[PDB]
Amino acid sequence: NRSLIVTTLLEEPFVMFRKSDRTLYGNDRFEGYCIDLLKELAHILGFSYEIRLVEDGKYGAQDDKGQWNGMVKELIDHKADLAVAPLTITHVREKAIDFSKPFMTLGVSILYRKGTPIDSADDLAKQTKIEYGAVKDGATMTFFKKSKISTFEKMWAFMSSKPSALVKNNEEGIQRTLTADYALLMESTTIEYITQRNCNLTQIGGLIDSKGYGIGTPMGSPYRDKITIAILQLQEEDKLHIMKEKWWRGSGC
Amino acid sequence: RSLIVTTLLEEPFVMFRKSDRTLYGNDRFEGYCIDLLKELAHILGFSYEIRLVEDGKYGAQDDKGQWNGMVKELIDHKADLAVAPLTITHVREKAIDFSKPFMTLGVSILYRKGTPIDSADDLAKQTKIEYGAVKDGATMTFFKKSKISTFEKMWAFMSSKPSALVKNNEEGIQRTLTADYALLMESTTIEYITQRNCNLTQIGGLIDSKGYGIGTPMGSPYRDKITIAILQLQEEDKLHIMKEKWWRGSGCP
Amino acid sequence: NRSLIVTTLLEEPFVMFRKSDRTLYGNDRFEGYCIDLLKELAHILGFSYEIRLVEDGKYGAQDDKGQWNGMVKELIDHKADLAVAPLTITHVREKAIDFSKPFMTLGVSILYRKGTPIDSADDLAKQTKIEYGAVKDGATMTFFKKSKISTFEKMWAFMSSKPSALVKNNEEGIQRTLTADYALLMESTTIEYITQRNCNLTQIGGLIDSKGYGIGTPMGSPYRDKITIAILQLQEEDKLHIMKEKWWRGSGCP
Amino acid sequence: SNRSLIVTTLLEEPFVMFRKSDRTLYGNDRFEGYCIDLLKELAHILGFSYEIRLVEDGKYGAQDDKGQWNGMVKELIDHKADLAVAPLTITHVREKAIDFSKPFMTLGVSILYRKGTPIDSADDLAKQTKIEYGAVKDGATMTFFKKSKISTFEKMWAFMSSKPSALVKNNEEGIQRTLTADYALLMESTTIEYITQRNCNLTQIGGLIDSKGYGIGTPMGSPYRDKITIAILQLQEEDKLHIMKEKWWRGSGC
Ligand SMILES: N[C@@H](CCC(=O)O)C(=O)O
Ligand SMILES: N[C@@H](CCC(=O)O)C(=O)O
Ligand SMILES: N[C@@H](CCC(=O)O)C(=O)O
Ligand SMILES: N[C@@H](CCC(=O)O)C(=O)O
Ligand SMILES: [Cl-]
Ligand SMILES: [Zn+2]
Ligand SMILES: [Zn+2]
Ligand SMILES: [Zn+2]
Ligand SMILES: [Zn+2]
Ligand SMILES: [Zn+2]
Ligand SMILES: [Zn+2]
Ligand SMILES: [Zn+2]
Ligand SMILES: [Zn+2]
Ligand SMILES: [Zn+2]
Ligand SMILES: [Zn+2]
Ligand SMILES: [Zn+2]
Ligand SMILES: [Zn+2]
Give the containing element (helix H, strand E) for D232.
helix D225-237
- How far does residue B232's CA lie from ligand 15's centre (Å)? 21
Give the torsion through C-alpha atoms of A39, A44, A45, A46, to 10 deg. Answer: 70
Provide the total of helices (H) and of strands (E) in chain C, helices listed first.
10, 14
What DSSP assignment string belongs to D3-61?
SSEEEEE--BTTTBEEPP-SS---GGGGEESHHHHHHHHHHHHHT--EEEEE-TT----
Question: Mind telling me how many Å the CA of B122 is from chain A's nearest CA?
Answer: 19
Identical fold for domains A1-106+211-253 and A107-210, yes or no, is: yes
CA distance A107 to A100: 18
Q: Quick one: C79 exposed, middle or buried, by C-beta within 10 A (0-12, 13-18, 19+)?
A: middle
* Contact between residue C49 and residue C42 where contact means Cβ atoms under 8 Å apart: yes
Which one of 3.30.70.330, 3.10.270.10, 3.40.50.1970, 3.40.190.10 gives the CATH number of domain B1-105+210-253? 3.40.190.10
Contact D230/B225, CB-based, under 8 Å?
no
Give the containing element (helix H, strand E) for D117.
none
Which of B203, B199, B198 minimizes the C-alpha distance to B184? B203
Domain boundaries, chain B: 1-105+210-253, 106-209
CA distance A39 to C116: 57
B218 touches chain A (CB under 8 A): no
CA distance B41 to B222: 11
- The topology (CATH level 3) of A107-210 is D-Maltodextrin-Binding Protein; domain 2 (3.40.190)
D223 contact residues in B (CB cutoff 8 A):
221
CA distance C6 to C49: 7
CA distance C107 to C140: 9
CA distance D71 to D59: 4
What method did the depositors use to determine the structure? X-ray
Q: Is B206 helix (H, G, I), strand (E, B) or coil?
A: coil
Query: Which chain C residues in 90-119 lie under 8 Å from chain D, judged by CB atoms?
Result: 91, 94
Through-space distance between the first and last CA atoms of chain A, rounded to whole angstroms? 47
CA distance C203 to C186: 9
CA distance D204 to D197: 11
- How far does residue D47's CA lie from ligand 6's centre (Å)? 9
Provide the total of helices (H) and of strands (E) in chain A, helices listed first.
10, 13
Q: Does the structural domain B106-209 have CATH classification 3.75.10.20? A: no
B106 contact residues in C (CB cutoff 8 A):
237-238
A101 contact residues in C (CB cutoff 8 A):
229
CA distance D28 to D18: 10
Phi, psi (deg, nearest 5) at residue C178: -75, -35
Give the containing element (helix H, strand E) for A99.
strand A97-99
User: Which positions ≥6 away from D169 have C-beta within 8 Å?
Assistant: D58, D136, D137
Which of D237, D217, D229 minimizes the C-alpha distance to D6? D217
CA distance A201 to D230: 44
- How far does residue B253's CA lie from ligand 8's centre (Å)? 33
Residue B54 CA, chain-centre distance (Å), reads: 16
DSSP code for A27: G
* Contact between residue A138 and residue A56 where contact means Cβ atoms under 8 Å apart: no
Q: Is C138 near ligand 3, meaning CB less than 6 Å away?
A: yes
Centre a 10 Å sphere on the Cβ of residue D81 and count the other Cβ atoms it contains: 24
Contact B90/A188, CB-based, under 8 Å?
no
- What burial letters (b/e) apply to B5-41, b meaning 16+ CB within 10 Å? bbbbbbbbbbbeeeeeeeeeeeebbebbbbbbbebbe
Centre a 10 Å sphere on the Cβ of residue A100 and count the other Cβ atoms it contains: 27
Going B172 to B177 to B183 to B185, the CA torsion angle's sign is: positive
Binding-site annotation, residues of D for L-glutamate: 87, 89, 94, 140-141, 188
* Contact between residue A137 and residue A70 where contact means Cβ atoms under 8 Å apart: yes
A244 touches chain C (CB under 8 A): no
Through-space distance between the first and last CA atoms of chain B, rounded to whole angstroms? 51
Nearest CA in chain B to C187: B237
Q: In the beta sheet, which residues pair with residue D50? A: D5
Question: Mind telling me how many Å the CA of C207 is from chain B's nearest CA?
Answer: 6
Q: What is the largest CA-CA distance in chain C?
A: 57
Nearest CA in chain D to B221: D223
User: Which positions ≥6 away from C234 have C-beta within 8 Å?
Assistant: C37, C40, C44, C103, C240
The crossing angle, in degrees rounded to 10, of helices D140-147 and D151-162 is: 120
Centre a 10 Å sphere on the Cβ of residue A210 and count the other Cβ atoms it contains: 14
> CATH code for D108-211?
3.40.190.10
CA distance A114 to A131: 15
Resolution (A): 2.0
Q: In the beta sheet, which residues pair with residue A183? A: A132
* Contact between residue C248 and residue C13 where contact means Cβ atoms under 8 Å apart: yes
B244 touches chain A (CB under 8 A): no
Q: In the beta sheet, which residues pair with residue B221? A: none
* Contact between residue C145 and residue C62 where contact means Cβ atoms under 8 Å apart: no
User: Which positions ≥6 away from C94 have C-beta within 8 Å?
Assistant: D239, D242
Q: Is C173 near ligand 3, meaning CB less than 6 Å away?
A: no
Q: What are the contacts of D157-164 at 24+ separation with CB within 8 A?
A: D159/D129, D159/D132, D159/D133, D160/D133, D160/D134, D160/D135, D163/D132, D163/D134
C106 contact residues in B (CB cutoff 8 A):
237
Q: What is the count of residue pairs from A and B with beta carbons less than 8 Å apart?
A: 15
Q: What angle do CA A43, A49, A54 make, to 5 degrees?
A: 130
The architecture (CATH level 2) of C1-106+211-254 comes to 3-Layer(aba) Sandwich (3.40)
C232 touches chain A (CB under 8 A): yes
Question: Mind telling me how many Å the CA of A219 is from chain C's nearest CA?
Answer: 14
Phi, psi (deg, nearest 5) at residue C229: -65, -40
Q: Quick one: A118 exposed, middle or buried, by C-beta within 10 A (0-12, 13-18, 19+)?
A: middle
- What burial letters (b/e) apply to B57-68, b meaning 16+ CB within 10 Å? bbbbbeeeeebb
C222 touches chain A (CB under 8 A): yes
- The topology (CATH level 3) of D1-107+212-254 is D-Maltodextrin-Binding Protein; domain 2 (3.40.190)
Through-space distance between the first and last CA atoms of chain D, rounded to whole angstroms? 45
The architecture (CATH level 2) of A1-106+211-253 comes to 3-Layer(aba) Sandwich (3.40)
Which of C250, A38, B239, A43 minimizes the C-alpha distance to D235? A43
**Radius of gyration from C-alpha coordinates of chain D:** 18
- How far does residue B117's CA lie from ligand 2's centre (Å)? 23
Is the bond leading into C13 cis (omega within 30 degrees of zero)?
Answer: yes
Residue D158 CA, chain-centre distance (Å), reads: 23
Q: Quick one: D224 exposed, middle or buried, by C-beta within 10 A (0-12, 13-18, 19+)?
A: buried
What DSSP assignment string belongs to B61-104?
B-SSS-B-HHHHHHHTTS-SEE-SS-B--HHHHTTEEEPSPSEE
Residue C6 CA, chain-centre distance (Å), reads: 16
Give the containing element (helix H, strand E) for B177.
helix B169-178
Q: What angle do CA D87, D91, D96 make, to 5 degrees?
A: 115
Q: Is A8 helix (H, G, I), strand (E, B) or coil?
A: strand
The crossing angle, in degrees rounded to 10, of helices D225-237 and D240-248 is: 80
* Contact between residue D194 and residue D249 where contact means Cβ atoms under 8 Å apart: yes
Task: Determine the length of chain D.
Answer: 254
- How far does residue D41's CA lie from ligand 15's centre (Å)? 5
Q: Is B109 near ligand 2, meaning CB less than 6 Å away?
A: no
CA distance C102 to C87: 10
